[PDB]
A paper describes a structure:
Particles in the most abundant class (29.7% total closed particles) were refined to generate a 3.0-Å reconstruction, where we identified the additional density as tubulin (left). Thus, the tubulin density likely reflects a mixture of different tubulin forms, including α-, β-, and γ-tubulin (sharing 31–41% sequence identity), although several isoforms of β-tubulin were among the most enriched peptides from affinity purification. We therefore built our model on the basis of tubulin β-2A chain (TUBB2A), the highest enriched tubulin peptide. A tubulin monomer comprises the N-terminal nucleotide-binding domain, taxol-binding domain (TBD), and C-terminal domain. We traced the N- and C-terminal domains of β-tubulin, which adopt a nearly completely folded conformation (inset). The TBD, however, is not visible in the density, likely reflecting its unfolded state inside [name]. Tubulin is localized at the inner walls of one cavity, to the level of apical domains. The N- and C-terminal domains of tubulin interact mainly with CCT3 and CCT6, and partly with CCT8 and CCT1, involving residues that are highly conserved across tubulin isoforms and different orthologs. Of note, the CCT3/6/8 subunits constitute the hemisphere identified with low ATP binding and hydrolysis rates. At a lower isosurface threshold, the largely disordered TBD is seen to extend into the cavity center, toward the other hemisphere (CCT4/2/5/7) that exhibits strong ATP binding and hydrolysis, with potential interactions with the C termini of CCT1 and CCT2. Altogether, for the first time, a tubulin folding intermediate is observed in atomic details inside the [name] chamber, where nearly folded regions are held by interactions with the [name] inner walls, facilitating unfolded regions to attain native structure in the central space.
Residue numbers in the entry:
A (entry chain D): 21 to 539
B (entry chain E): 2 to 538
C (entry chain B): 2 to 527
D (entry chain H): 312 to 388
E (entry chain d): 21 to 154
F (entry chain b): 108 to 214
The structure:
């Protein structure tokens, strides 16, 4: 007879958290894998969202249980660190907790469960690293295969042939492939434009802007010299309170004339540099482009794009080599950007786009134009392309590749079963639970594919025991096979981060024993 | 209760005399008197358990849920959400005792309740309430004269402060701060004696700043002969300590001058604009140069300043405080001996104050800083910095120390001292009994009742101390009458002796006289009421 | 009779007055509720709580900090509010002990209710408790040891104190890691106690062991547009100027002219004033310019043309930490460059953490301020890690201030209880029976510590009491196996400051709650 | 400053001067005079006392008591 | 320092009972003696009753406090045993309790008050018998 | 009081079956101690009568009849001896007559 445990609310709270987490995991289990389907989510305001992304789904469904909120945060963290695996990580967490259920029932302490899970996590990191193979970013076929694998799960998979090479070119254009250890995907701009179909998605090497052109008649410019103007082309206005007191009739005409002359001198100093395309920053508190200024620029045959946003300035400069000018005195030729073409293109009556294509200084920036027949499919195309870019980012960060189709999860189950048999004690039960919990991703892949999950997962385990560690669930043939012939590969970072974050979240939730209702 | 008018007519026609007479109430006569007495007795029996060293505290909760633990009768009755008008009168009585004296706020209420409780039995026997009030006035006069007779006197000099420290310890014995009994008494005495006008016999409490900061221990409470401010130096790279500080006190913001009248400075040319720019620059430089040429090593402004002024102070090695409040500016001037300057042009080396130490003080893991100004030459201002483990004990420490300061003030106003522990009350009760024996009119009963009421304070002390009330009080009364010693009272602390002059239990004569007078006057005003009218709901 | 139970009620509709037993009942029940709530978080094997606010934001916190727990609950019992404020003041004074002071106060009040039932006056109880507080103070102070002189032993004591502070918290998973982090970060302050100098950046993602202490400094601000991104041998000007449509402080000033030409001349003059300001800045010989305020397009362009990296919109804390880390002087006037000290660091680059870019200052000069990047799987994990790190850093700062240390694992509480017991059995009267209760509460502290682990608390506290009665003043709980051991060897040591504060604040709050015999509530504002 | 009009008029009738909207002619005929001026503490409040005016056609009662209504009924009496 | 008396509800109950009893006594005090007057009592049903009899008055006014009910029963018992004195007995009871008020406040135990009252009662019966004439 | 001690023990983390076990052992010990301390005087008629008077006095001490305990003790003892060994307590009729003093009561 040990300690009576006079209180049962800690155990009830643990069981409630485990139940909530397993419920979330089982709710999103259906959106896992190439044969997984999407969920529609109608917000309280009526914003509809069709998606296959686990992080998106969990953030969008306003879960209420604390454990479910924590799983949402877990999926967001996985989306940050890897950008792919946001469903697998939640499923793994839910499964680990569902195993903690029976462990707790057996009568093991939550601290012992947590420590044994940490042990299993370290061993599993070892196993995944051993499974991994190195990759060179020059292996364009390997990159294409990673991107196709990332896209197979999404609505954009019949267009994978189109969006994988784009997702590889984009990332390979915004990094120095020899020195890069990461990538900032803010260098990759995505522009969602309704209309057409997803086969109309495009990779624009130059710059794309949604701002409209103010000139009528001047839509296309060849051999374009472009200048960014952070000052206002309108009547002068000091930063102090200023007035113009008229006391004689002559001063009225004088005021109008001097205003005209000021504006004309401005536009002449602009024209004198050879600038024929003019991007004007957005200006509140003062008119950035007066009617006089627009008249004069149009007469001088200069394309004008105002309302540029103060957050797109660094991007536009990085793109077309321009330098932002805030005083007319410093507006010279060395502050311009040379582009082989600047055109206002129409998209079959579905809007207009300004494309600045060709650049003498195309500095590590690219844009992707996302087309589509519906707002929902456009949003999911954007999310999926982001997932592909994040997969390439994982490959850039960690030069290691792992097979897919549940092969890593199955190898984990197997080798951690062995580890458990070697770690005799009460940690053995917990490690065996960890293994059987990691055996759930292949089971889910099979279930979603439409196979018999038990038979499929047993065949997988048997073949991995024989030694085919690169063996997985071939949803094309309908059974098990060497998954590299199907070319299902994913960065090691995805699986490693998923496992790590799921284990940390499980340990945190296991360290909880009470819930309070603050105020 | 009863209604204003219950006839509606001897003819059946409507009889409406007072507005909303049907919703209004009225109580008349002896039942009204007894209702008053019941309410007053309820209040007094609430308060009587907070009397003496072994007295317990009360936990007051306001409308918004803030908690106040206290033994102060005035604070209790002010925090008390009373609806009865006689209870409101008793709250006013206690507040009056606090205003005039600053101590006795519970004795006044207990005594008034006892007087009304005895008037209850006198009214039952059929005496006119005005006759009761007049007998109470007579007995109160007798008791006041007996207090003047048995009073003692203490020396209020600054050389030997032991009598004043004993008085303050007696005052603070009943408060939660009796854990630091002598430290608190010492700092109250030193505070009033530092800031007290001996010739005028006046003590201005605006010159005593009582500041509290959570953290530390109650034992950390100390007396600063100077000022503490809730500010820090204006620039984070300024030094946090300044020794031999010559202080410039200024009520001019370190900013370009600005007329109070509606003004428009017109810029009409690039030359005008550049002249304005140079004027602003030179104004900032000239301000800082004037402060430096005055010889000051520290500046204290009331109205804050801007980046140029802050950096110029830093460059010129002039630590500075900004956004100091008017009262603290005044206290800093008074303490450092400096004069408050309204503009820099009017600043001279003689208008500066001197403090031997100006320091910025931290409070652990808080990020909040305080500024101490001390080591002045002859600071006529002072600060009491109170520490403790919670805001409840900090607030109680504040009010208890206020009680102690008020007691020392009352000593400075009149040095005569009676000894407490109920001894003075027992002696006045004996004197009143003797005068009632010599009184042959019908007021004899009222005076005997007044004596029996005066005797409730020793009984209350005994009860709160667990002793048997009647036994203890009768024995000490018998001893007082046998061996003439009006310093025989209740051994609340169980020191063995009943001699309060030996236990150093000390009260102020004006305090006791004010207690008796206020209780008697309010009891008279209550007994004189025989009709209440109140609106419905 | 009584205020409430009188033929006339003297109160406004909605008020109330609980008398002696009712008041003591509600007070003891509230305090003991608070204490039972906050325990089970006590000690290495303590477990966390979910706060789960109920507002329209429905905040969600996972905490082990007693101060945080008490702050984030809707309390309506006045005595409970007293204990809550006590724990808050403990958290303000030091950064640890916020659960131990509350548990101690609650146990003392439980024993006090027991004594009231034993028919003891709640003034004899406070008297005996004051005597016991004196005895415990003296025993603790005599048991304290100081190693600030020996630098190596002081470093070891710092590592042990950080480890003991983190043991109870979610960071015990990587305790050997976060201990080193916290100790290095508190030593980088070079004796200063400014805990604002230690900045903590919580970056969602990564494991909790991916967290680190930057060898230099990190800043979550942006660089201008046409300005460099890498700078070697950086000379830095930290400023607080306007550099944003900076107007002459004369506020009645207005431009009143008769010509648009004159308006344009004045506008050009404003621009020339800004240009001259920028030129005065550049005459300091700098490569980096940090401003507390914004930097508008024109000075941004000027700094870009000059080849200077101009970081804008750092805050008061940002520029303070930068001055501490580089050595510069926060300036707002540039007419005396010889007097403005510049900051230096070997390199300033832009690094990635998660998906966000940050300014990285490497090779800094002073380093008296620090940046800690906290990585984690959930925002709850990150917030709890920040709270735990704040605890550890506060304790290490308080120890650098006062190097006195005191062994943990219930050794200190048991020693104090031993002293109180000697005083009690040598003192006559019922004050002895109250001192014994004081000691019982002191013993109930490690009792709870052991209970939360799952051991035979009664047996282990009996062993500890026997050891401290025999004279093994260093015996404490060994929470690895669940036995008693030598705290001096196991490295379980606490700050004398924190233990003394726990003791004294608990005794003080219990005293102030015990003096209450009436609770008079006023009609809620509703 | 902000002295009430009635107290100012009483100070005038007591000390023997006149109230001046302009400070340009402050002669001894318009200035007032008393034998003693003091600021003292009176029961929690601070009061300014002008005493010693022999030509005073005014007086000020200062009523003490333990309640607002006590003092009000004293004033009515 | 004796026993703390951690509970105050006993004293509150004693004082409430004493107050109720004294209130009844003072309410019927006016119907005592040759110069005493009668009370009219209109029942809930509207049955009017004018009376000078203490037992009748107390039985007809539906007193609610327990002590007042007990005084009603006391007056009924006096009406049974003697048929005269039903007002004097209630007044005496109320007055004895009104004295218990100040005794309790002085700090005497209710048991001591009861025993001393029994002593005084026996002595008073002795005194009244001495006064009596056959 | 037993349940108060049991809550204390549960807080001490003792199983409420170990508590019942120890309580049963304690009940056995208390039973045996009580039974060994018990004394019988039914044989001696005079001492048995004295024990009856003492038991009646002890039973009435706690009650309102402690005022006239020496009277009501004799009442109760005589009334229980008039039953001549039978236990029929309905045989003892009690008539409550309002009026008179409590000492006017009789058998
Ligand atoms: N063509 C395929 N054949 C077999 N398995 C696949 C294929 N494509 C993807 N998978 C598997 O599907 C999983 C990815 O599913 P996905 O819906 O992206 O979940 P997550 O968002 O968690 O990555 C990976 O574990 C991968 O092994
Ligand atoms: N140490 C002591 N011994 C005996 N009597 C004391 C002692 N200290 C104070 N008293 C008495 O307690 C009475 C109540 O004073 P107290 O309640 O402390 O202040 P207040 O009445 O202003 O609230 C005083 O009349 C005083 O004589
Ligand atoms: N490794 C350890 N071994 C034994 N006791 C420990 C250990 N770490 C902490 N403690 C004990 O746990 C207590 C700290 O628990 P904590 O949750 O920090 O409470 P608090 O918030 O009140 O400081 C201290 O009293 C200390 O003695
Ligand atoms: N003519 C009288 N003169 C003086 N006293 C009288 C006279 N008649 C009656 N009493 C007194 O009045 C009392 C009777 O009053 P009563 O209304 O009968 O009250 P109770 O019903 O309690 O006796 C007696 O105590 C008696 O002494
Ligand atoms: Mg995917
Ligand atoms: Mg006092
Ligand atoms: Mg801690
Ligand atoms: Mg009669
Ligand atoms: Mg019995």
């Amino acid at each position: 007879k040990g300690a009576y445990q006079d209180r049962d609310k800690p155990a009830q709270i643990r069981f409630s958290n485990i139940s909530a987490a397993k419920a979330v995991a089982d709710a999103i289990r259906t959106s896992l894998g190439p044969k997984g389907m999407d969920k529609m989510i109608q917000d309280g305001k009526g914003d509809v969202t069709i998606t296959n992304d686990g992080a998106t789904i969990l953030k969008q469904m306003q879960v209420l249980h604390p454990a479910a909120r924590m799983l949402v945060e877990l999926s967001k963290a996985q989306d940050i660190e890897a950008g792919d695996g946001t469903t697998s990580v939640v499923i793994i967490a839910g499964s680990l907790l569902d195993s903690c259920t029976k462990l707790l029932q057996k009568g093991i302490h939550p601290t012992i469960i947590s420590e044994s899970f940490q042990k299993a996590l370290e061993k599993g990191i070892e196993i995944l690293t051993d499974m991994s193979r190195p990759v060179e970013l020059s292996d364009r076929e390997t990159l294409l295969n990673s991107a196709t694998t990332s896209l197979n799960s999404k609505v954009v998979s019949q267009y994978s042939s189109l969006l994988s090479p784009m997702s590889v070119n984009a990332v390979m254009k915004v990094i120095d492939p020899a020195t890069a250890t990461s990538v900032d995907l803010r260098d990759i701009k995505i522009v969602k434009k309704l209309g057409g179909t997803i086969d109309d998605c495009e990779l624009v090497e130059g710059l794309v802007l949604t701002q409209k052109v103010s000139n009528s008649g001047i839509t296309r410019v060849e051999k374009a010299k472009i200048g960014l103007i952070q000052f206002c082309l309108s009547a002068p206005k000091t930063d102090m309170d200023n007035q113009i007191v008229v006391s004689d009739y002559a001063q009225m005409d004088r005021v109008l004339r001097e205003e005209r002359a000021y504006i004309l001198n401005l536009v002449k100093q602009i024209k004198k540099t050879g600038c024929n395309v003019l991007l004007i920053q957005k200006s509140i508190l003062r008119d950035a482009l007066s009617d006089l200024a627009l008249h004069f620029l149009n007469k001088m045959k200069i394309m004008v794009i105002k309302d540029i946003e103060r957050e797109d300035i660094e991007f536009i400069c990085k793109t077309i080599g321009t330098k932002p000018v805030a005083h007319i005195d410093q507006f010279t030729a060395d502050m311009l950007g040379s582009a082989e073409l600047a055109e206002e293109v129409n998209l079959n009556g579905s809007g207009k786009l300004l494309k600045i294509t060709g650049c003498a200084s195309p500095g590590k920036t690219v844009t992707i134009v996302v087309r589509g027949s519906n707002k929902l499919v456009i949003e999911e195309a954007e999310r999926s392309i982001h997932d592909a870019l994040c997969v390439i980012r994982c490959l850039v960060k960690k030069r290691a590749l792992i097979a897919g189709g549940g092969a890593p999860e199955i190898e984990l189950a197997l080798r951690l079963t062995e580890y458990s048999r070697t770690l005799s004690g009460m940690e053995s039960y917990c490690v065996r639970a960890f293994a059987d919990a990691m055996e759930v991703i292949p089971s889910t892949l099979a279930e979603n594919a439409g196979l018999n999950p038990i038979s499929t997962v047993t065949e997988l385990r048997n073949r991995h025991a024989q030694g085919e560690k690169t063996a997985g669930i071939n949803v094309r043939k309908g059974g098990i096979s060497n998954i590299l012939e199907e070319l299902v590969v994913q960065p090691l970072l995805v699986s490693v981060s998923a496992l790590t974050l799921a284990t940390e979240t499980v340990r945190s939730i296991l360290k909880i024993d009470d819930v309070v209702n603050t105020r | 209760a009863s209604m204003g008018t219950l006839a509606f007519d001897e003819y059946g026609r409507p009889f409406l005399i007072i507005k909303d007479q049907d919703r209004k109430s009225r109580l008349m006569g002896l039942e009204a008197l007894k209702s008053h007495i019941m309410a007053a007795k309820a209040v007094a029996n609430t308060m009587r358990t907070s009397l003496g060293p072994n007295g317990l505290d009360k936990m007051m909760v306001d409308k918004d849920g803030d908690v106040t633990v206290t033994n102060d009768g005035a604070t209790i009755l002010s925090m008390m959400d009373v609806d009865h008008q006689i209870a409101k009168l008793m709250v006013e009585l206690s507040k009056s005792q606090d205003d005039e004296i600053g101590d006795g706020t519970t004795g006044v209420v207990v005594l008034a309740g006892a007087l009304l409780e005895e008037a209850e039995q006198l009214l039952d026997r059929g005496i006119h309430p005005i006759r009761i009030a007049d007998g109470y006035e007579q007995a109160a006069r007798v008791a006041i004269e007996h207090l003047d007779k048995i009073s003692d006197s203490v020396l209020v000099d600054i050389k030997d402060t032991e009598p004043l420290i004993q008085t303050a310890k007696t005052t603070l014995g009943s408060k939660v701060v009796n854990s630091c009994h002598r430290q608190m008494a010492e700092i109250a005495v030193n505070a009033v004696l530092t800031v007290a006008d001996m010739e005028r016999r006046d003590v201005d409490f605006e010159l005593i700043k009582v500041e509290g900061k959570v953290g530390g221990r109650l034992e950390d409470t100390k007396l600063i002969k100077g000022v503490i401010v809730d500010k820090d130096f204006s620039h984070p790279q300024m030094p946090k300590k300044v020794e031999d500080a010559k202080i410039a006190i200024l009520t001019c913001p370190f900013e370009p001058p600005k007329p109070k009248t509606k003004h428009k400075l017109d810029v009409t040319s690039v030359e005008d604009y550049k002249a304005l720019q140079k004027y602003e620059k030179e104004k900032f430089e000239e301000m800082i140069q004037q402060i430096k040429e005055t010889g000051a090593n520290l500046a204290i402004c009331q109205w804050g300043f801007d980046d140029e002024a802050n950096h110029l102070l830093l460059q010129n090695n002039l630590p500075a405080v900004r956004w100091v409040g008017g009262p603290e500016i005044e206290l800093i001037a008074i303490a450092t001996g400096g004069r408050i300057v309204p503009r820099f042009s009017e600043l001279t080396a003689e208008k500066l104050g001197f403090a031997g130490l100006v320091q910025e003080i931290s409070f652990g893991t808080t990020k909040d800083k305080m500024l101490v100004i001390e080591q002045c030459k002859n600071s006529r201002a002072v600060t009491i910095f109170i520490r403790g483990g919670n805001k409840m004990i900090i607030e109680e420490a504040k009010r208890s120390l206020h009680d102690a300061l008020c007691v020392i003030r009352n000593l400075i106003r009149d040095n005569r001292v009676v000894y407490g522990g109920g001894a003075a009350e027992i002696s006045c009760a004996l004197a009143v009994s003797q005068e009632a024996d010599k009184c042959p009119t019908l007021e004899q009963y009222a005076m005997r009742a007044f004596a029996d009421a005066l005797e409730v304070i020793p009984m209350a002390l005994s009860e709160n101390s667990g002793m048997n009330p009647i036994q203890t009080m009768t024995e000490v009364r018998a001893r007082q009458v046998k061996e003439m010693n009006p310093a025989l009272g209740i051994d609340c602390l169980h020191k063995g002796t009943n001699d309060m002059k030996q236990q150093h239990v000390i009260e102020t004569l004006i305090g006791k006289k004010q207690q008796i007078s206020l209780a008697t006057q309010m009891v008279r005003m209550i007994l004189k009421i025989d009709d209440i009218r109140k609106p419905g709901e | 009779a009584s205020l409430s139970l009188a033929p006339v009620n003297i109160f406004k509709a909605g008020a109330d007055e609980e008398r002696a037993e009712t008041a003591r009942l509600t007070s003891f029940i509230g305090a003991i509720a608070i204490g039972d709530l906050v325990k089970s978080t006590l000690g290495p094997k303590g477990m966390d709580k979910i706060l789960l606010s109920s507002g329209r934001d429905a905040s969600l916190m996972v905490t082990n900090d007693g101060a945080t727990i008490l702050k984030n609950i809707g309390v309506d019992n006045p005595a409970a509010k007293v204990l809550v404020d006590m724990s808050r003041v403990q958290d303000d004074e030091v950064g640890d002990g916020t659960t131990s002071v509350t548990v101690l106060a609650a146990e003392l009040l439980r024993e006090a209710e027991s004594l009231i039932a034993k028919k003891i006056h709640p003034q004899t109880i406070i008297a005996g408790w004051r005597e016991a507080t004196k005895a415990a103070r003296e025993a603790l102070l005599s048991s304290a040891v100081d190693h600030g002189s020996d630098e190596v032993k002081f470093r070891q004591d710092l590592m042990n104190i950080a480890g003991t502070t983190l043991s109870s918290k979610l960071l015990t998973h990587h305790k050997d890691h976060f201990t080193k982090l916290a100790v290095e970060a508190v030593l980088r302050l070079k004796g200063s106690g400014n805990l604002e100098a230690i900045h903590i950046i919580k970056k969602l993602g990564g494991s909790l062991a991916d967290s680190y202490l930057d060898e230099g400094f990190l800043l979550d601000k942006k660089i201008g547009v046409n300005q460099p991104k890498r700078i070697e041998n950086a000379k830095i000007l930290i400023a607080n100027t306007g550099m944003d449509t900076d107007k002459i402080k004369i506020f009645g000033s207005r431009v009143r002219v008769d010509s648009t030409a004159k308006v344009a001349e004045i506008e050009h003059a404003e621009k020339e004033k800004m240009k001259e300001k920028v030129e005065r800045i550049l005459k300091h010989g700098i490569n980096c310019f940090i401003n507390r305020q914004l930097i508008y397009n024109y000075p941004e362009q000027l700094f870009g043309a000059a080849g200077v990296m101009a970081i804008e919109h750092a805050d008061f804390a940002g520029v303070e930490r930068l001055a501490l880390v580089t050595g510069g002087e926060i300036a707002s006037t540039f007419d005396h460059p010889e007097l403005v000290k510049l900051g230096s660091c070997k390199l300033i680059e832009e690094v990635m953490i998660g998906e966000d870019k940050l300014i990285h200052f490497s090779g800094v000069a002073l380093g008296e301020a620090c940046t800690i990047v906290l990585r984690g799987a959930t925002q709850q994990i990150l917030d709890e890690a920040e709270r735990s790190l704040h605890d550890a850093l506060c304790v290490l700062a308080q120890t650098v201030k006062d190097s006195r240390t005191v062994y943990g694992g219930g050794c200190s509480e048991m020693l104090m209880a031993h002293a109180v017991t000697q005083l009690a059995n040598r003192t006559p009267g019922k004050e002895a029976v109250a001192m014994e209760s004081y000691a019982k509460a002191l013993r109930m502290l490690p009792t709870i510590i052991a209970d939360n682990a799952g051991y035979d608390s009664a047996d282990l506290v009996a062993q500890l009491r026997a050891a401290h009665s025999e004279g093994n003043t260093t015996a404490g709980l060994d929470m690895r196996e669940g036995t008693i051991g030598d705290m001096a060897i196991l490295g379980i040591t606490e700050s004398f400051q924190v233990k003394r504060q726990v003791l004294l604040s608990a005794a003080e709050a219990a005293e102030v709650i015990l003096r209450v015999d009436n609770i008079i509530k006023a009609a809620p504002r509703k | 400053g902000r002295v009430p009009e009635e107290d100012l008029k009483r100070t005038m009738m007591a000390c023997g001067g006149s109230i001046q909207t302009s400070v340009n002619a402050l002669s001894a005929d318009v200035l007032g005079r008393c034998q003693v001026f003091e600021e003292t503490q009176i029961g929690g409040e601070r009061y300014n006392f002008f005493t010693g005016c022999p030509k005073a056609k005014t007086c000020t009662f200062i009523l003490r008591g333990g309640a607002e209504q006590f003092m009000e009924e004293t004033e009515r009496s």
